[PDB]
Design a protein around this ligand. Structure first.
Ligand code: HEM
Ligand SMILES: [N]
Length: 184
């Protein structure tokens, strides 16, 4: 179930978030914890291409080896709040599963600055969803969450101590593939 209307950041700077670069997930929290694994690697690139907001996603489960990339076109609901389609692709952008009606995620940027962000997303696949997921992002894959993003976590009535870190997984990313997916 999707249960939260996530509040976008006051003064959100869209151009700085959607600048073409990679954001690494450093910490995450699902409100239905059994919906996601306890060990995981994820990253995204976010930018504008051909006049549209785009994200490219990467997921990797280091226990099962499941690996997948996605390309998304984001439509604007309001500043910092988006509805994204998705197509599953290989690292080279070859579509494995096309954009499909009712395959979408919502995406809200709750906080962002030059180095860090806090987002909310709820994923829909037909009549099922994967629950409310929060993620702390950083421009540096290893970086400890700083005071400002932690203040944003608390101001959303969340406890940072409940987030799961991706650090122990020593994740590695294909940054060229991921960023280049923005034009796919
Ligand atoms: C550590 C962070 C994350 C974890 C642990 C996580 C976990 C998952 C898992 C377990 C699935 C497969 C669900 C299923 O097959 O039912 C999935 C798929 C997906 N995730 Fe997440 N995810 C994370 C971050 C994100 C972020 C930030 C976004 C969007 C910006 C996102 C968007 C999606 C989409 C669109 C799919 C479906 C992919 C497809 O079928 O093509 N994920 N992720
Ligand atoms: N997700």
């Amino acid at each position: 179930a999707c249960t939260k209307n996530a509040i976008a950041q006051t003064g959100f700077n869209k151009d700085k978030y959607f600048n073409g670069d990679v954001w690494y997930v450093t910490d995450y929290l699902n409100l239905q914890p059994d919906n996601v694994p306890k060990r995981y690697c994820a990253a995204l690139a976010a930018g504008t291409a051909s006049g549209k907001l785009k994200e490219a996603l990467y997921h990797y489960d280091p226990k099962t080896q499941d690996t997948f990339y996605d390309v998304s076109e984001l439509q604007v609901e309001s500043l910092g709040k988006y509805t994204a389609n998705f197509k599953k692709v290989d690292k080279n952008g070859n579509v494995k599963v096309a954009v499909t009606a009712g395959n979408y995620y919502t995406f809200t940027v709750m906080y962002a600055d030059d180095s860090s962000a806090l987002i909310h997303t709820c994923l829909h696949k037909g009549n099922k969803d994967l629950g409310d997921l929060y993620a702390v992002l950083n421009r540096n894959k290893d970086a400890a969450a700083g005071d400002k993003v932690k203040s944003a976590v608390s101001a959303a009535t969340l406890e940072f101590s409940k987030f799961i870190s991706t650090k122990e997984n020593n994740c590695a990313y294909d940054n060229d593939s991921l960023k280049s997916l923005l034009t796919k």
